Amino acid sequence: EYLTKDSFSYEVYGIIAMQAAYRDYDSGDAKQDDNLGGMQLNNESRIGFRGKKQFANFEPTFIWQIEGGYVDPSFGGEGAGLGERDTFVGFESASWGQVRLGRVLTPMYELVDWPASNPGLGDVYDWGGAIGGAKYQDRQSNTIRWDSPMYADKFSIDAAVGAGDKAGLGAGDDYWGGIAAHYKLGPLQLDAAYEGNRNIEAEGQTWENNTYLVGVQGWFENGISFFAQYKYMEADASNGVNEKQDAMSAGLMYTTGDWQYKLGYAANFDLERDGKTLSNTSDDVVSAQIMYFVDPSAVLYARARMNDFNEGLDGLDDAARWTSGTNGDYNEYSVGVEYYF
Amino acid sequence: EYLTKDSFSYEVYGIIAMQAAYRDYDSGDAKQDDNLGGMQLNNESRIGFRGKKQFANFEPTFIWQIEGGYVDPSFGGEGAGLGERDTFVGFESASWGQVRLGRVLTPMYELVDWPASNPGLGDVYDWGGAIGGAKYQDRQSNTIRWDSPMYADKFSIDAAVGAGDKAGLGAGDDYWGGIAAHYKLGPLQLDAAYEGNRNIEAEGQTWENNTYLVGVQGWFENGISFFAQYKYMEADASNGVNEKQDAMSAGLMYTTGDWQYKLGYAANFDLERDGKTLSNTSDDVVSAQIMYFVDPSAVLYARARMNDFNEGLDGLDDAARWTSGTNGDYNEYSVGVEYYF
Amino acid sequence: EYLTKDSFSYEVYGIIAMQAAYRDYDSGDAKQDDNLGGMQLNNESRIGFRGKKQFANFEPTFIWQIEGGYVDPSFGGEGAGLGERDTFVGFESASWGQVRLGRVLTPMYELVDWPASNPGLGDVYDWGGAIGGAKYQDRQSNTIRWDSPMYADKFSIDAAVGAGDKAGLGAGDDYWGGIAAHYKLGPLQLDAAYEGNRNIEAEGQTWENNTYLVGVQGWFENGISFFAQYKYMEADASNGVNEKQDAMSAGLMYTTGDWQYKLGYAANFDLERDGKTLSNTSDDVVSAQIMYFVDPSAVLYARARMNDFNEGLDGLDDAARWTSGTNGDYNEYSVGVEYYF
């Protein structure tokens, strides 16, 4: 009558995550600075569910997972639903790897975010950017996504296509596709990825976007580790207009006993529209962090960082293009905790 | 202190369900056709919770359940909450069956939807219809519902009443009740059901609605199976106006080893307002489907279907009445998967 | 190979709760009376998750929990998310007690609500009130909160500070802090609590608020129990204006075998603005209830009550201040059930 792991058809998994996070804004509205600014909590804890199933008439193993969103972020109300995060189904054989339908990370985004949005670099390197149309999607519903196996312990591919933000609501024909690749090499790992976005409606124009990324990551027998990337973003409006913007992000780490120190930098460079540059569309961030390996399963950290954002641009409709900078330059000290089970 | 089934006071249950689904619209706006049209995923996976409890001072066994909504449907955003689907409490004795309070299916709806909205027929036979007021509720909050036992292996009753869509928000005095019945007979099963809806506010008129259904269902020793129904809908405005509309839905099936083939048809007939018919308020759908019994616990399927919808009508306020047809005629090929645990 | 309690890193806990609840409104719009009025179900069931963790490098035990909102209340739509209720992380040592970051009850609110909003008294004693600004927060995101241990079996402190309703969305600089205290004494328990609220934006003024509470609670060897409180609320606008309002709430109980009878009363008194009283800003409620201890884990109850609310006031902008009375005087009979696991 007792239970085993085999009694259940699902696993609960969770990621408990809290960050007390103080911000000092410097947008040059003294008022706006206090709203945005100050301390908040940022609970990005969440729960999920997943399981396998060996169907009796299909050798590829069935897989499914349903992850809840963040329960009470900062700048946010409480509560969140099941499947705001990685929710999907799929299959897996050892020979061809796996494929997932639904709501996953794009293969481009998985690198933009990790390792290269950590820590605090997201504002600039993730959704920061001044480019038109859509540089890439991130987590996206309506996606199919192949993850190849590790070919001869070195080479891996992340391939995916899916529907757009609008089209998954039947309010557009926006689509996209993307591919990434990863080459393990001694202590290195080479990352390259791509993602084209088509029929994007924005500023009263249709946009095709293309984004390319190269980067590298190292882990060394002595405790030094690092990551670095260059991202390039093109885009083209249906009225002829071209835009270009490139960025980067870099991270240096020292690890020692139960500790890890981390400096990160990232930046988008001035933006080009039709050969002419747009002065002060630069963004950058510097960041620093101490982290403590408080349990095999958890970490504490303390963190400071500084965003200096762009001084703004119009989109193609003669009206301000929203950027991770429209709220304004801010800095931010935070302590936090994270627990995996 | 190992665990058993008896260690827990709840059960997690899930229904994992994914459907890649391509649509070709033919509304005669070329633009509108692309938005709506195209492929989308349709994750209707969800999770729930439920348990019994034998209260020491009450012989009837306590029952409760909380089912999450669909996590990332088509034409929809991601995420969903606990108790968007069948959420309730109740009790049960073998002599009188069970009763449930909260959010359940109406006894009418349980038949409209099953078997007779499957497969793809829902657009027409479920929420499709041109009639005024409210034909029936479906899943409804604020409901009490009795499910009688199987009297002498043949006769069963589904009985229920509850509050309206408005009244459960304290913005109305809408109410309703409904009853169904089921008679098992050799290889057949006779279904009849009813549902009256009162004080419904709509088109600046209060409406009383009455809807009646008869149908049948057969399973044969040789692998043929089928279902058929006629649904009749009356409604009456508080300004005198009458409306009538009838429908039907039929399903033929062949099953064989691990396979099941399925043709379905359904249709609402032109609508009558005060004796005069409204030409082209007809809707129909034809649908076909192969399904494969991929595990005791799961099925794969492939499916095609064609909706031809009504060409539109006004409500009693001289302004378009919304119908499952306002977006327009479309067809749709889909593959999907479904897993129960 | 089997599982134990120690196999999991989380616990599922739930509170299943249903209340059929009929209301007869008497606002003197005959229409309004029916909308609001009538029966509804009130499912306040919900689910949560929580767990401890003994980090290898930190003696204080890690604690976390994530509680879902109410699944289908009355006057409400269905569904709710994970972490609409008490969601947090924290730590605990026996010497200093515990601390929690996130979304918790304020230390003031925990007493306002319990024991002194039960049963039905909430309308008047919880969010009822006519005072300006914000008397107190209740459940609040972005809060840190210390719960001291029980010092020498008598003395306990609940201390907390957090951000405002706006500021947790970066749309304000509202903050607050609060402290309660509890002295066990023979069969009594003395409660006192406090909560100041700062920079509250409302009626085109900034408000500082201060709210003070004293109360008492008794349990007697013979089956009688009771509670009582007096709550005092000051507030001060940034345009000079002062307001004052005091309230109370009292509860008498007899318990016997498996039964408990309960009379409750509560009331807010007329409100003072700048020394002058606002006639008929009084609110009160009387309530009665029988409850049956149907299982170690659950209760049934039946309940009647009567709210007589204020006849209305303006805020400082010459426009109606919302109160738990704007909808109007109502009474209400209800039966319900509650199950803990």
Author numbering:
A (entry chain A), B (entry chain B), C (entry chain C): 10 to 350
Question: Mind quoting what the paper says about this structure?
Answer:
The gene encoding for ChiP is found in most marine members of the Vibrionaceae, emphasizing the general importance of this OM diffusion channel for chitin utilization. The addition of micromolar concentrations of chitooligosaccharides such as chitohexaose (GlcNAc6) causes a complete block of ionic current, demonstrating tight binding.
Subsequently we cloned VhChiP without a signal sequence and with a C-terminal His6-tag into pET28a to express the protein into inclusion bodies (IBs) and avoid toxicity issues. VhChiP from IBs was folded in vitro from 8 M urea and purified as the native protein. In vitro-folded VhChiP forms a trimeric assembly of oval β-barrels, each consisting of 16 strands, like the general diffusion porins OmpF/C from E. coli. Unlike OmpF/C however, the N-terminus of VhChiP does not form an intramolecular salt bridge with the C-terminal carboxyl group. Instead, the first N-terminal 17 amino acids of VhChiP are not part of the barrel and extend into the periplasm where they form a trimerization motif like that observed in the phosphate transporter OprP from Pseudomonas aeruginosa. The first nine amino acids of the N-terminus are disordered and not visible in the electron density. The N-terminal ten residues of in vitro-folded VhChiP are highly flexible and do not insert into the pore.
